[PDB]
Amino acid sequence: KSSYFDLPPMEMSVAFPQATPASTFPPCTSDYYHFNDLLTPEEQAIRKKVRECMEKEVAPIMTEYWEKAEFPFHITPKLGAMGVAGGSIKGYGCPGLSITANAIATAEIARVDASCSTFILVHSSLGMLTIALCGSEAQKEKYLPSLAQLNTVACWALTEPDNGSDASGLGTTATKVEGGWKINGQKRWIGNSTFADLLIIFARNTTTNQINGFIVKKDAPGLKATKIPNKIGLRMVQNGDILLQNVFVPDEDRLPGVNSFQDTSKVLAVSRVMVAWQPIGISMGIYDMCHRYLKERKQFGAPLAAFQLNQQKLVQMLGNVQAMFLMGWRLCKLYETGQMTPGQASLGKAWISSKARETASLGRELLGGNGILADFLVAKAFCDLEPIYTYEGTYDINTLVTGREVTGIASFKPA
Amino acid sequence: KSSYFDLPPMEMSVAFPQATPASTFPPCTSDYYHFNDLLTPEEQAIRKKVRECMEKEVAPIMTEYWEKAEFPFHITPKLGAMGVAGGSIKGYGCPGLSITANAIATAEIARVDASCSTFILVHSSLGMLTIALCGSEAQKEKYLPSLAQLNTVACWALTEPDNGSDASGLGTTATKVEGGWKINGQKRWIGNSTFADLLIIFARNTTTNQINGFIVKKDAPGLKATKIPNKIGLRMVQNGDILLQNVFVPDEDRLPGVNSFQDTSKVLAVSRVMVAWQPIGISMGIYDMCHRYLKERKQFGAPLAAFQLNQQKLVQMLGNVQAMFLMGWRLCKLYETGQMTPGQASLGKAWISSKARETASLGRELLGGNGILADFLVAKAFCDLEPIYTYEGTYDINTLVTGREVTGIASFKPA
Amino acid sequence: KSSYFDLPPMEMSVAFPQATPASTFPPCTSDYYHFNDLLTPEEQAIRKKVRECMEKEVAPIMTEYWEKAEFPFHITPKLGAMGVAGGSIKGYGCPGLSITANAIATAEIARVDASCSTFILVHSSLGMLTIALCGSEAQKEKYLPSLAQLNTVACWALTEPDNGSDASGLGTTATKVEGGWKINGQKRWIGNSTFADLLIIFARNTTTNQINGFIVKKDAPGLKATKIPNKIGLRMVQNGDILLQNVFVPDEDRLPGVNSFQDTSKVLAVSRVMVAWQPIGISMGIYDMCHRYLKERKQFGAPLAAFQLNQQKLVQMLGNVQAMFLMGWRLCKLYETGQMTPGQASLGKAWISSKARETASLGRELLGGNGILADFLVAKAFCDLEPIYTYEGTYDINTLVTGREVTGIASFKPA
Amino acid sequence: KSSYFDLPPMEMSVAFPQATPASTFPPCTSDYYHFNDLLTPEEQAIRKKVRECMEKEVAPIMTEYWEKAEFPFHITPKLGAMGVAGGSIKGYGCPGLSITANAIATAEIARVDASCSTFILVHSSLGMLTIALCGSEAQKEKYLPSLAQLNTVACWALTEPDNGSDASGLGTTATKVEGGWKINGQKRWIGNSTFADLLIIFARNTTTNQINGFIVKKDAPGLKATKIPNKIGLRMVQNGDILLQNVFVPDEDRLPGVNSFQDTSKVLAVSRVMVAWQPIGISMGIYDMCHRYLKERKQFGAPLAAFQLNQQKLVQMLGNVQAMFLMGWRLCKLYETGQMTPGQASLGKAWISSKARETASLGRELLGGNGILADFLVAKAFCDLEPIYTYEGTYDINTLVTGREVTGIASFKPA
Numbered sequence A, B, C, D: 001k002s003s004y005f006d007l008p009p010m011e012m013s014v015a016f017p018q019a020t021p022a023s024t025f026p027p028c029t030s031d032y033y034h035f036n037d038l039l040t041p042e043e044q045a046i047r048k049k050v051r052e053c054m055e056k057e058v059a060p061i062m063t064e065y066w067e068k069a070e071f072p073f074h075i076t077p078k079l080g081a082m083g084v085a086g087g088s089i090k091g092y093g094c095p096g097l098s099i100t101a102n103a104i105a106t107a108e109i110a111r112v113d114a115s116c117s118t119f120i121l122v123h124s125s126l127g128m129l130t131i132a133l134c135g136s137e138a139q140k141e142k143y144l145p146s147l148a149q150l151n152t153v154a155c156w157a158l159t160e161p162d163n164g165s166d167a168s169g170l171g172t173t174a175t176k177v178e179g180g181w182k183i184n185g186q187k188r189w190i191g192n193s194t195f196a197d198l199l200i201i202f203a204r205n206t207t208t209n210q211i212n213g214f215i216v217k218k219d220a221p222g223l224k225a226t227k228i229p230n231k232i233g234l235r236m237v238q239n240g241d242i243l244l245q246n247v248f249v250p251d252e253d254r255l256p257g258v259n260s261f262q263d264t265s266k267v268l269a270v271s272r273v274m275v276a277w278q279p280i281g282i283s284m285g286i287y288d289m290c291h292r293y294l295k296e297r298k299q300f301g302a303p304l305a306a307f308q309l310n311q312q313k314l315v316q317m318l319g320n321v322q323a324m325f326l327m328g329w330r331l332c333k334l335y336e337t338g339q340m341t342p343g344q345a346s347l348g349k350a351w352i353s354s355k356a357r358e359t360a361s362l363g364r365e366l367l368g369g370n371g372i373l374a375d376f377l378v379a380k381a382f383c384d385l386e387p388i389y390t391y392e393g394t395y396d397i398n399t400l401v402t403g404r405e406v407t408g409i410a411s412f413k414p415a
């Protein structure tokens, strides 16, 4: 309670004149090993298209929305014009991009805002891909064209409160009834669920006692998806607690390609390739910001980029970025050549996100105080990395997928 | 848009039944090296006292205020009843506690909530202490009785946009006028500055060319303090941008004991010990949460505590924590005996600060998904640590303070 | 072949004039937090006495011996004059030191040479202590006084080719025979064993199927112990493969206090406190050496200590040292007060080990090329830490000992 | 003294029968991202030839030689027959391999023995290359053919006691006299120098004040090279202190293409790509050995590979190896494409080197006790990695080479 307590925050141009905030997004200086050499002409055109659009459309508004933990619904039709949704799905009204074209688009979104990327990743590299790989021809033709336009939104429900890392032992049931299925259970952390038109729900078929997948609809009687508050990262992403009580799904809406967790495993493997590319994008952005910031901000009568400790940290981030990118690039190519094991994807995601965590640490301390401000990207990025390091399998779970594959010995279960 | 988009969040007890959230604070398990042995009877009594008060009064409401970036004003008299504000200042209405007493109280506050400790710390171990050291006996008798009971609040303005790490090159001017002084300049990041009744403004005396100190008042004409938004950590702390335009301050509100920057470094050495104790407590709280969570939460039919990977992470935290306490404790003992150099104070704050960053990182990934949720503390703590790692000297600035002392060569300025 | 190939190496004063080799041992600048304040006047006396002797007697010759992987037998009587061997054993011709005194001398020995410390450690803290804690009055008086003078050397044989980390399941058998026992099996890695007078051999008593302990004598029929070659660290220590072929040990030389692994486990805990002081010692040595080296060595027109990067590495070391020391210190008091658990000793030894590794790594790179020369200590110290990080239980085994204790759930056995 | 003290060590098959030592070299499992996909068929063939030669000829003999710190001269005609010496030099009796061809060759040599690698690299990528890039046709035709056959050995002398990192400022002098030059000064750390036939000595022309390069011959009047003893890594490489007192060098032996430091600095960037590949090779070997050791060695009734903690380490190493290779591979393509900058070569060398250090650290602790024995490779490579992390420019110096380039500000010089 003062004369000034109620007053609107001081404008950034007056509050910190020395540096530019992320509204005017930093230029790409993280690309140090000339990555366009590794990209097809079509892939280069997508990279710059996604980037120009994210910097113009999303960067100026992301700070507000991230702070309020609100989703920028108005940005959806643009993201659908970007032709990103539907990744590498061929036909059914999808763009039919290369896995690498999709991967670099993923990074180019994540570079600017990780929530938008997660939004699309969950919608497209999980939601749509599960329909593409596991759906009927009828389902694909019915559901994908619109999903690709972003006229409808998908989400992907696997995780439960009782079942997170231990996904194959999920407890959401699916009971065969007359004319379809009856779904019962509870799902947790499902991004988009609070407004998704389509909800791919993984439920245990109670006849076969194996895991099946079902396309649930928005507003189905017995369905309730509600917002998870107080997240420190991915604040624009709407993560849902879902309740299903005798939610009905007709025969035609069961995914025929999901007959046990082995198929969910096959989806997650391809999905982990796309998730790997999020930390790559984020790291690229953090460096870009850090690079500009350090050159702009002056202390002790010199740019902050003049000091040894600041340079060592800047180059450490820079090396991490080149390696991560190449790491993610190889992964894509392994997939394309049809020779990719789940262990290779797990390691891709585990390793990359670990080095990204490291990179965000350094990038965060490099901006000093402003490094904790959403305004300057890094804080946002630093916070957004944490759940990414957790989802699509934790670091520990992913390294054990690889460890099992590389050694021949499962090491998940307790003594 | 949905029939359930607007609905309130699911109750945590139904949302995630397995683990209990921070609103019911975890028991102390972090204290593995029986630290009460290093505490005197009245030092123990205070540890107990603040602990209970923080768990009962602050824990149940800290989630929602932190999320909304609001200060919990209703909580301030309860903190004033604890008799911790005023620190080690003898007399003048203050508690006259030992340095070690002040330190674990700083830790036990930070254990539950870092924002609250920061508020107290800038108020008591910066605001009140500069009055207690650099003040006249008059300034002591007038402001200190009210500041100790928390009936009035203090802040401490050194940092500004152009001068943060280079505090010595402070730009804010102080022209001499009859009756007193006019303050012209700008400050930034100042904790409590939006509602502080007293604002200790550091400004350059244009007559002597040196930095001085001025107790400016709330609602002084020309003075505007405005909240800094979009912080990722220390969200309840009201850090401000301060505009000073011809701000009048009479002869009696100037601090007679600060005629040079040298005087501010004298104070900053003592504060850097209290600040060193923030990460200690925060890290204790993190281990405390983690210990209980890993025992409650089951995965693959076992508690999360049963897994090698988790036990290692938890044990690394434990070790870190013991070492951090011992480090801070010796830092108090060096102060108590009048042999503490600034380098010693800096090493402590740097080292402890760093190991906390490491501890929080481990703690955060130990909780999986829920580790990003403020409701479970470790997410709050993980974020709160970043600012703490940065302010009162960055890790780098502090290390080069020690570096200069121990090699005789200053390495702050560039080539 | 060359006209200079066979010529002796260049003298250090000529080959590298700028910096002093370890032969003139550096002054103690690692003690930054004034550690004598935590020691009794007796504890201070020993620290000093043990340093004076290590610097004068061992430093000038330790390089030549560490390179040839040889033990300096002539050094033995000088070590037994220090009054170290025996440790905390009360009576029976032992010095009856405090636990902290025995801990400090270990650090001061390890500070100059780690091999020398490991010699004394295996001898006094493992070998002699086993006779104190599990021996009978008869054999305590028979063997201990000679051991404390170092007129005779002891070793401690637990590890086997098949049982290192899994010591509880050892396979060396001890067959009850008229008038004593017959020992059969192999031991690996036993320090001093190639010249030890007393070999404490742990073997499975074939009547009870539990581990027992036996005092075996040098040159006993069926005993042969050979050096382990090609060691990168602790190269002065004579580690042996012991082959035991029907070795006769009479009823009088069976330790009546060892009746299962629980007794040998009781011993390891007290020993791990002393081992924990070794990396403390070594890290002090590395710092002391680096500090002097960065002031003497000059590059780009200034002392290496002038550079931001070097100063930070040095300060990081300095921070670790102070924390490691306090950690070892607190651990001693825990033991002195009868409140030490095995899990507390395991934490000390795990954490301090890990911190030393970090320190040595930093310390090694700081000296550039000379950082890989035994002459300049760091290289020797750096290598020596590696087996210390492994023996007395690996970092992982010790982590899980603490792990099991704090969680109450064992996590050693596989999935 | 003992009846068994002078006996030879126990043969490994009886000492530790559970695991196979490096003398029988492990199969390649570190190639997890199918690296041959990124190599030309010529490059795959070279990779194959070198690997089979190193495993057959060097692995069975390396342990004894590394421990004695002696060079295996008898291996020279084999290494010569591999067709590596000469690297990418086209013509003049050299094999004219591609850049990646020489890179993978480097790695495969280093994979088995780092000393052998450094031997060839200093001879080929420094000695021979300096003549190719900076020699006259007359001296290229005269010296290279025999050098490519290893019938003569070259070395490359830049460093001196007073100039290591600051190489630009060396004090070795070249005075113009009738018929040629007289070289005066001292050199340190020069590999192959005790037996090298040709010695490329860099010395400051006294007329022009710039660094020049001179082909000095073995046993030249005034030349004395002596072995630097007591190294902990690359123990097989013969590094020298070189003494030059009025060493005469004829006009025809002055490299006419070396006129200032920027000529030698241009060579350093090309050879720095090759050095980068040394860590890549070594890490692969470390992984390869670990993989096999962890499957073979049983403890607690399971392979060491069965335990979470061990799998995590193993997978972290594997992640690193993939990233390092891709990193090294990309660097080669940047050079092949003619677009490499010093900063990029510096970044590669710095980053890859640091990752290899982390890897060696993990691989070392994964083998327990035996991880300190040269017999099981890991120990040797761990140690070998330290000089590699230091030479060809340090981590600090290399990072600052990139820092200067990306930021535009040099930060080598002190305040």
Ligand SMILES: Cc1cc2nc3c(=O)[nH]c(=O)nc-3n(C[C@H](O)[C@H](O)[C@H](O)COP(=O)(O)OP(=O)(O)OC[C@H]3O[C@@H](n4cnc5c(N)ncnc54)[C@H](O)[C@@H]3O)c2cc1C
Pocket (backbone or CB within 6 Å): A122, A156, A157, A158, A159, A163, A164, A165, A166, A188, A189, A190, A191, A234, A239, A387, A388, A390, A391, A392, A393, A394, A395, A396, A397, A411, A412, A413, B297, B299, B300, B304, B307, B308, B309, B310, B365, B366, B367, B368, B369, B370, B372, D308
């Ligand atoms: C932002 C966000 C979005 C998400 N979106 C979706 C979504 O769209 N769809 C969906 O289905 N799910 C989603 N999830 C859930 C996500 O997949 C889970 O957070 C994660 O996969 C499971 O972890 P958990 O939260 O259950 O924690 P837990 O599984 O309890 O793990 C806690 C800790 O224990 C460790 N651990 C667990 N098991 C072992 C083991 N066997 N050995 C060693 N260590 C172990 C883990 O590494 C982790 O550190 C989302 C989560 C987040 C945070």
Ligand SMILES: Cc1cc2nc3c(=O)[nH]c(=O)nc-3n(C[C@H](O)[C@H](O)[C@H](O)COP(=O)(O)OP(=O)(O)OC[C@H]3O[C@@H](n4cnc5c(N)ncnc54)[C@H](O)[C@@H]3O)c2cc1C
Pocket (backbone or CB within 6 Å): A297, A299, A300, A304, A307, A308, A309, A310, A365, A366, A367, A368, A369, A370, A372, B122, B156, B157, B158, B159, B163, B164, B165, B166, B188, B189, B190, B191, B233, B234, B239, B387, B388, B390, B391, B392, B393, B394, B395, B396, B397, B411, B412, B413
């Ligand atoms: C939550 C919060 C609360 C705060 N509260 C207060 C307060 O109450 N009172 C107050 O006065 N201030 C306060 N501050 C400001 C804080 O003290 C400053 O952030 C910090 O001391 C100076 O950093 P800066 O933000 O100016 O960034 P900079 O000073 O520009 O530093 C940016 C980076 O450059 C590095 N760097 C700077 N100088 C050098 C150098 N010479 N050599 C090598 N590296 C260098 C730093 O390590 C840092 O990584 C607060 C800040 C935060 C985030």
Ligand SMILES: Cc1cc2nc3c(=O)[nH]c(=O)nc-3n(C[C@H](O)[C@H](O)[C@H](O)COP(=O)(O)OP(=O)(O)OC[C@H]3O[C@@H](n4cnc5c(N)ncnc54)[C@H](O)[C@@H]3O)c2cc1C
Pocket (backbone or CB within 6 Å): C122, C156, C157, C158, C159, C163, C164, C165, C166, C188, C189, C190, C191, C234, C239, C387, C388, C390, C391, C392, C393, C394, C395, C396, C397, C411, C412, C413, D297, D299, D300, D304, D307, D308, D309, D310, D365, D366, D367, D368, D369, D370, D372
């Ligand atoms: C220099 C030196 C001196 C020694 N002196 C003595 C002596 O005097 N007396 C004596 O009795 N012994 C001695 N030893 C033996 C030493 O105590 C053992 O090396 C150690 O206790 C067991 O290691 P190991 O060599 O058998 O390796 P292993 O037990 O094979 O372990 C290999 C790796 O696997 C990991 N690992 C093992 N078990 C598990 C598990 N359950 N879960 C997860 N990870 C696991 C370990 O952490 C380690 O990294 C000495 C060793 C050295 C190196």
Ligand SMILES: Cc1cc2nc3c(=O)[nH]c(=O)nc-3n(C[C@H](O)[C@H](O)[C@H](O)COP(=O)(O)OP(=O)(O)OC[C@H]3O[C@@H](n4cnc5c(N)ncnc54)[C@H](O)[C@@H]3O)c2cc1C
Pocket (backbone or CB within 6 Å): C297, C299, C300, C304, C307, C308, C309, C310, C365, C366, C367, C368, C369, C370, C372, D122, D156, D157, D158, D159, D163, D164, D165, D166, D188, D189, D190, D191, D234, D239, D387, D388, D390, D391, D392, D393, D394, D395, D396, D397, D411, D412, D413
């Ligand atoms: C096995 C081995 C083989 C070698 N072979 C050869 C050879 O064949 N030919 C040859 O010419 N040389 C050779 N060298 C020398 C090698 O290139 C040098 O050791 C290296 O360039 C660094 O020199 P230095 O050892 O004097 O380190 P120093 O220059 O003494 O540096 C010591 C420390 O100070 C730091 N430092 C130095 N300058 C700065 C700065 N400006 N800013 C921040 N930090 C700084 C460094 O990072 C390092 O940690 C060899 C060295 C080794 C170990």
